[PDB]
From a paper:
In black-grass, upregulation of a phi (F)-class GST1 (AmGSTF1) has been shown to be a functional biomarker of MHR. Recombinant AmGSTF1 has been shown to exhibit both glutathione-S-transferase activity toward xenobiotics, as well as acting as a GPOX, reducing fatty-acid hydroperoxides to less reactive monohydroxy derivatives. The Phi (F) class GSTs, of which AmGSTF1 is an example, are found in all higher plants, being homodimeric enzymes in which each protomer of approximately 23–30 kDa with the catalytic serine residues located at the interface. Each protomer has two distinct domains; the N-terminal domain adopts the typical thioredoxin-fold, with the C-terminal domain being a bundle of at least five helices as demonstrated by the crystal structures of AmGSTF1 presented here.
To investigate the native AmGSTF1 active site in more detail, a cross-seeding approach was utilised whereby microseeds of the Phe122Thr variant crystals were used to obtain well-diffracting wild-type crystals in the tetragonal modification suitable for ligand soaking experiments. Following soaking with the glutathione-NBD conjugate, the crystals were found to diffract to 2.3 Å. The NBD-GS molecule was seen to bind across both the G and H sites, with the GSH portion of the molecule adopting the same conformation as the unconjugated GSH molecule seen in previous structures and the NBD moiety extending into the upper portion of the H-site. The aromatic portion of the molecule is seen to form a strong π-stacking interaction with Phe36, with its side-chain clearly rotated from its location in the apo-structure. The hydrophobic side chains of Phe122 and Met126 complete a narrow hydrophobic channel perfectly suited to bind the NBD moiety. These hydrophobic interactions help explain how the GS-NBD adduct acts as a strong competitive inhibitor following the conjugation of NBD-Cl. Interestingly, the GS-NBD conjugate in AmGSTF1 is seen to occupy a similar position to that observed for the related inhibitor 6-(7-nitro-2,1,3-benzoxadiazol-4-ylthio)hexanol (NBDHEX) and its respective GSH conjugate, as determined in the active site of HsGSTP1.14,21,31 In both cases, the inhibitor ligands are seen to form interactions both with residues in the α4 helix and the loop over the G-site. In HsGSTP1, these ligands are thought to stabilise GSH binding in the active site by preventing its conjugation with natural substrate molecules and subsequent dissociation. It is likely that the NBD derivatives play similar roles in AmGSTF1. Crystal structures of wild-type AmGSTF1, together with two specifically designed variants that allowed the co-crystal structure determination with glutathione and a glutathione adduct of the AmGSTF1 inhibitor 4-chloro-7-nitro-benzofurazan (NBD-Cl) were obtained. These studies demonstrated that the inhibitory activity of NBD-Cl was associated with the occlusion of the active site and the impediment of substrate binding.
Author numbering:
A (entry chain AAA), B (entry chain AAA): 2 to 216
Write the structure that this text describes.
Amino acid sequence: APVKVFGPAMSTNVARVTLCLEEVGAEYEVVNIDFNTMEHKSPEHLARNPFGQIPAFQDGDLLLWESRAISKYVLRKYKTDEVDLLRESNLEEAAMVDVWTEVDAHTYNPALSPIVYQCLFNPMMRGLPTDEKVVAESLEKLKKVLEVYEARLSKHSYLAGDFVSFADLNHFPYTFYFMATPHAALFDSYPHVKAWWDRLMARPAVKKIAATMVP
Amino acid sequence: APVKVFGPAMSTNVARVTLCLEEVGAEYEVVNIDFNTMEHKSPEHLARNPFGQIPAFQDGDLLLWESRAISKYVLRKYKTDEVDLLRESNLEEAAMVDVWTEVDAHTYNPALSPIVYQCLFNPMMRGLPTDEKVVAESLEKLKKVLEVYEARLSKHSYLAGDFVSFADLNHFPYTFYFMATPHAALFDSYPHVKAWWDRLMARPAVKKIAATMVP
Ligand SMILES: N[C@@H](CCC(=O)N[C@@H](CSc1ccc([N+](=O)[O-])c2nonc12)C(=O)NCC(=O)O)C(=O)O
Ligand SMILES: N[C@@H](CCC(=O)N[C@@H](CSc1ccc([N+](=O)[O-])c2nonc12)C(=O)NCC(=O)O)C(=O)O
């Protein structure tokens, strides 16, 4: 049976989930939620996610929220020998996937996301202006974060090691929107980060979700 | 052999790791890192954590950072039948542990932590004053977050279900410092959240780490 993803397909946190689904070949459906109509706060959505945020996820009777929890459920349930993006079979490998999934959430996203938010999601979505001081500050922070990624990705093809993993998939959605800002060329200053990004953009599952991240 | 935790024992993110270690009965050592001397940026610390933050962790040749990644490595490595705080044996249970570990990081900590930071870690640690507007705003947010916890914890003894888990352990460290602020009595307005907190405070492993979270 279809598992179901609740939110607009464009949403970065929906795309984390839908990318994990494509990468394991799961049958799924995307049920839109209309921010313009406050559906994410409707009682039917609070049933799914009592904090009233997208995405939510339904597998039969199971209702999940927080894109990363959802994601790990998809990767565990549909795990084949050919697709172990969590490396739970290997304690040290599962540890490196964990470290870099935490780095995405606590170090990299907090430096990148406000540039996406200020340069893109504020003018284009909301209509509110671009805070050039939030941008200059996040950009300086992101330069320093990409110095450590550059080091990591000149030793290993992927963040976890020499295998694509959940760690890498975590970075795709917000970075894809970063690449539609005026600051996209920043990655060109980090040739190994760039090469890693192009390898990710070349994966069939990423090209398919990239396709869904338009209005 | 000792595994090693790098940071001051007081640190909330050190305590997440040290609590997971006590809860599985692992032999470990805490190697101090002196913020007053910038040791967290020393070259010896950047070897452990290239972003120059505590905690770091060493198991033999393995070097880990991000307290939650560390934590899951400890819980997987020292997993007994009697201590499965990740519930990886059960896909739905492992999913609920994930959801509420994400909620701690993305919903609960961002509303609680600035009250700890403003009321406690700024005057007592740093010497900078308390932003009463950050406090009033985080408190209103935290009230709404605790309404959803109150609902959850009137159906299940713990956030994951009727079993203590990593989800619950995640909430201990910052909440322990919240309980040393003037706003500690806030939990008394959420009788099930409170009862859950007292059950956590009664666990031998939590009393032992509580003991380490003083100057
Ligand atoms: N840690 C969570 C984060 C979930 C999250 O931040 N979701 C946002 C998604 S924000 C969003 C807001 C607004 C619009 N819009 O169309 O104007 C969006 N379109 O797509 N996503 C949109 C949300 O639902 N916020 C609403 C709220 O907190 O009240 C996760 O990874 O799932
Ligand atoms: N997501 C990470 C978060 C790690 C973290 O925020 N660590 C802080 C810990 S902050 C801290 C800062 C200052 C003092 N002090 O003694 O004045 C501390 N004592 O204990 N912890 C202290 C840090 O090292 N920051 C330094 C930096 O970013 O430059 C995780 O869970 O491990």
